[PDB]
Design a protein around this ligand. Structure first.
Ligand code: SAH
Ligand code: SAH
Ligand code: SKA
Ligand code: SKA
Lengths: 267, 263
């Protein structure tokens, strides 16, 4: 079956994606409340911090796939990669990132996430040094379409192949069917060198989430399907953890049942 | 301590209502591949399919009145010892093992197990093999530092351990859970294997006139607990409860599967 139709549907829906609302729905309290150790924020940050602390994920270059208007996914990573490439389909998201990069006041304040990262990394790093390091190591913010055989376009900047990939809430939020998800994964995988690592975070059993006016339709995937897709793309799953969304965190911004975190290494 | 508040509650535990609430439709319908029944069986079948879990002697901690958790396992261990706190449960297990009247019909699960393993084995041989390899059904208390305790007809130390929905369901708190995990880890010989299945974020469940208070545990908490007990988590999976399998018998949010090895 042709993908174009579904892809065109996805592309269209995102043209109504709103950064501001997106950030508030998912990265402001209650979801953006890092105080409760059992919330989703802390758990995500713990997964990333702990994986990097094994020292097994290192290199020079890293590419964040579908960054959106967020940087939390790179807080623990920036102390291990000198060259970081951020990416997103939407220009308005790339501007939102540019806004934070310029330390402008009208930008989202990630300090809460930064402090927590420094907190669990346990190196007595103050969050300001942490944010400073990230801003310095983000070498580029590029456009991307995971549905293309070459997601970054052709002859794009991004040093290739990247030593590591990081991607949160992208693949499953932009793929019509499960076959698309698998294809999307194979496409970004061509950006990672053999032996490289992939840090993937995502929503489990989700069909919709809100980005302001947007009521984006998402393909629900399970742990089993993610694991299966990772192996089908040539990865050895090194770690796959699941977080069950608590009742108090089901604010009505989406219908997500859980969140997965996968650490896979390209074979 | 004082833990024994649970002990009293389990005195009203009715094996039949338990079987009916968890192993009869809808949860007991194995036709849906996305149901919990199928998921649990795949977890067990795939693990034993790797061929790394083998030996003589295997112990099933807190078997209750169920045998499904041993369907795939019984073809890798010639000496199987099942266990449980209540005498009522041990009698229900006996009713199935001795093929007595009023025994529970596990055929659906046996068939599914045979279907999954894909060895062309009919379910009657499967049950026959399980019935023969189960030598005895002994009492147990995962809270007593020596569960089976003293001179036990159980060939300890065992080579592998299987336990489903026991630890989190008989412990009042996380610490009591962690300690109980140590009490059973003793029965397992070093380099041995533990196959652990349990409820995720559940606080209560019914079994007839019995209302049980369980310690809600997360996957993260279960892993960390496995380590602190001297294990090397080989695999950990989570099954999120579908709305249609969320009935009035409990408040379970999901189910976890853990494949761990005592190092
Ligand atoms: N075809 C496509 N290829 C790549 N990214 C896409 C895409 N279509 C939409 N996206 C982007 O995927 C993102 C999903 S939202 C996830 C944002 C962020 N990574 C976080 O963790 O919160 C949006 O930023 C959206 O613009
Ligand atoms: N102190 C204790 N030590 C071990 N098992 C106990 C216990 N107190 C209660 N139990 C038993 O633990 C069981 C929990 S119900 C789980 C039954 C079965 N394993 C299944 O998968 O369905 C009950 O059969 C109960 O009698
Ligand atoms: Cl924790 C978290 C953060 C962001 C998003 C989600 C979750 Cl659960 C699910 N909807 C897509 C965006
Ligand atoms: Cl699938 C299944 C089987 C048994 C039990 C449960 C579940 Cl979800 C939860 N309550 C404890 C007993």
């Amino acid at each position: 079956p042709d993908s174009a139709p579904g892809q065109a549907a996805v592309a269209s829906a995102y043209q109504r994606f709103e950064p501001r609302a997106y950030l508030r729905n998912n990265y402001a309290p209650p979801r953006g409340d890092l105080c409760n150790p059992n919330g989703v924020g802390p758990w995500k940050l713990r997964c990333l911090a702990q994986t990097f602390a094994t020292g097994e994920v290192s290199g020079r270059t890293l590419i964040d796939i579908g960054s959106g208007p967020t940087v939390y996914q790179l807080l623990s990573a920036c102390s291990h990669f000198e060259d970081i490439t951020m990416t997103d389909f939407l220009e308005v998201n790339r501007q939102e990132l540019g806004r934070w990069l310029q330390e402008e006041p009208g930008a989202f304040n990630w300090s809460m996430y930064s402090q927590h990262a420094c907190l669990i990394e346990g190196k007595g790093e103050c969050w300001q040094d942490k944010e400073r390091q990230l801003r310095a190591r983000v070498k580029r913010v590029l456009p991307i379409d995971v549905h293309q055989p070459q997601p970054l376009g052709a002859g794009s900047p991004a040093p290739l192949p990247a030593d590591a990939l990081v991607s949160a809430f992208c693949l499953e939020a932009v793929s019509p069917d499960l076959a698309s998800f698998q294809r999307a994964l194979d496409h970004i995988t061509t950006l990672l060198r053999p032996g490289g690592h992939l840090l993937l975070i995502g929503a489990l059993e989700e069909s919709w989430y809100l980005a302001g006016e947007a009521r984006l339709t998402v393909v629900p995937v399970s742990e089993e399907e993610v694991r299966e897709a990772l192996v089908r793309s040539g990865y050895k799953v090194r770690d796959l953890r699941t977080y069950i969304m608590p009742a108090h965190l089901q604010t009505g911004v989406d219908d997500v049942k859980g969140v997965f975190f996968a650490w896979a290494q390209k074979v």
